Symmetry: C2
Subunit: 139 residues, 2 copies
């Protein structure tokens, strides 16, 4: 049984995306509870969120055998990880966010379009900072 | 312009999924850098990860207008957030992870099948604990 090409590979990718989003959603919910004064519920969202971190990183460990789910590229060492991050960030600022910005403007969501443009610029900053770190990597 | 049904809705959901995964991936990479001794790189993966948290939560905020990407339910208040988390967790432990476990076992990935079964049990625990919290909520 080779993981590359299997249904189990696409399920690990899907579950990794879901666990990742669950951690994000639960911390967002924790902050809503914070403001409401629901400190016990905020603590519970935070603790559950740690569980989803453990789940997501377990999925990622299995996916080391087949590649980074965001890029298809090898990950593992810091050199590989920086390489995969630069490629993903480059996709985000040259393709994904500008194209989402265009569609938002075309559909009449001007503020959301400016938000996608703000994020394209941020991901370009991320990309260039990771590239600088890769240039300085001594491994 | 109505966000519900637009291409911009689907793009917010996709970008939220992407930003969520980026934070998880970058923290994973930070831990790899930790063990290698690449502390400057680890610090950069963590700082960048904070940016991806900010991005994902900005996407979620726009999605308040159409519903939780995991469930379709409204979100915002702790009462709503708990109900959505419960519905999502219930799908995970009754349908998603048991189904992935079966596919993995059938494909020859016994360890991954057991992992999916561990996670089914874990999400059931989360679902029940959130339900307890929802019954205790005073708002
Ligand atoms: Fe989980
Ligand atoms: Fe980024
Ligand atoms: Fe980002
Ligand atoms: Fe959970």
């Amino acid at each position: 049984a080779q993981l590359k090409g299997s249904k189990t590979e696409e399920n690990l990718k899907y579950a990794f995306a879901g666990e990742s989003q669950a951690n994000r959603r639960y911390l967002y919910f924790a902050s809503k509870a914070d403001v409401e004064g629901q400190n016990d519920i905020a603590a519970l969202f935070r603790s559950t969120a740690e569980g989803e971190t453990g789940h997501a990183h377990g999925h990622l460990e299995y996916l080391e055998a087949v590649g980074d789910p965001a890029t298809g590229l090898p990950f593992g060492t810091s050199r590989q990880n920086l390489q995969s991050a630069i490629a993903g960030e480059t996709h985000e600022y040259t393709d994904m966010y500008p194209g989402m910005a265009k569609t938002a403007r075309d559909e009449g969501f001007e503020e959301i379009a400016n938000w996608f443009e703000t994020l394209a610029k941020a991901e370009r900053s991320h990309a260039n900072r990771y590239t600088k770190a890769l240039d300085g990597l001594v491994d």
